[PDB]
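Immunoglobulin G-binding protein G structure dump, as promised
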Amino acid sequence: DTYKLILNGXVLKGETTTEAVDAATAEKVFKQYANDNGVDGEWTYDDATKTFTVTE
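structure tokens r here:
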């Protein structure tokens, strides 16, 4: 499936997508991308939209 990532860094925002077989795998990809790019914070998932948010 296509999963989405919302990255909220206070006044700064971003977003991205990945293809993955399930949600746990997409989150591993999203958590590495977020961390590689300086974005650390609280994670939540909307399984109705297959969208993760990381909030600084």
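The domain at 2-55 is CATH 3.10.20.10 (Ubiquitin-like (UB roll)).
lmk if u need the other ones
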